[PDB]
């Protein structure tokens, strides 16, 4: 198991922990704020996913300071993990291309 693949895996597992923790913390953060809609766990988990992927449809989003803070972590964990998968694929291509060049 090469490093880039161990990191990709680690990244995926971690991102999933951030999606769950984040969903739990968003709801906890948003309740108490009138008009808040990021207030039930199931859709909160869905919200976290569309936030981690950066899609952000606009159906759900935090309105509180702490909920938005939770959001930032989720966004960054999402952008960073996927990016780390991109970098792991680049490594795979570079090394195979090396072998192919007989370097």
């Amino acid at each position, epitope marked *: 198991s090469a490093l880039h693949w161990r990191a990709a895996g680690a990244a995926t597992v971690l991102l999933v922990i951030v999606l769950l923790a984040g969903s739990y913390l968003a709801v*906890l953060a948003e*309740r*108490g704020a*009138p*008009g*808040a809609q990021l*207030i*039930t766990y*199931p859709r909160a988990l869905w919200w976290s996913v569309e936030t981690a992927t950066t899609v952000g449809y606009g159906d759900l989003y935090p309105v509180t300071l702490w909920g938005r803070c939770v959001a930032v972590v989720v966004m960054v964990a999402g952008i960073t993990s996927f990016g780390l998968v991109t970098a792991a694929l680049a490594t795979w291509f570079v090394g195979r291309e090396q072998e192919r060049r007989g370097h």
Partner: antibody
Amino acid sequence: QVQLQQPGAELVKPGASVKLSCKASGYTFTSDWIHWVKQRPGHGLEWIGEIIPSYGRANYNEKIQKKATLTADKSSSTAFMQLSSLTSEDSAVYYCARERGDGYFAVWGAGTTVTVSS
Amino acid sequence: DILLTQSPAILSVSPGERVSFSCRASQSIGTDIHWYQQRTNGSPRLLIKYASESISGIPSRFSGSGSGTDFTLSINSVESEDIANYYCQQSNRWPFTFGSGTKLEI
């Protein structure tokens, strides 16, 4: 079987305060929220507030004067709602319900009848 | 905060007839409306969740519909056990709110 247990009644002298209990059973999830609903005789349901025992955080209906204070004892699976300095206006049946974090009240207690008089 | 309006406070129906309870939301709330039944001296009982999702242990006689601002709780072929106060409640925006309620009269 009976999931939420509330004592039948509580008498309270005007101005005094009381703490109602709500012992829970059945499944318990860290995602559970315990709610308190006030129902005056001949009136509908009124939401007082909520609490996430697995964290201790509570929120209150900001549309009504805050006469309550929610707390929970994670070990005794007991949620308590403290009503402070009551008046005849506070006399009513107070139910507690368990919400799995999905928006609806799956189960309710029998409710405690609170009466404020000397 | 979302206001829920329950059309007529009382509904008169003949035995076995079909009855529909209306619950209007002051704004668009998807299908995040839940119905409760409460008989005299009783605690509220969940009848329908998320506007139309049935709850086991509840007669198939009960069904709900609607989305957005208008929701309906229906009882197909009403019977005496059904005499009670029916409430709708929303979980779309905090804080959760209840409708004033509608009494079923046979």
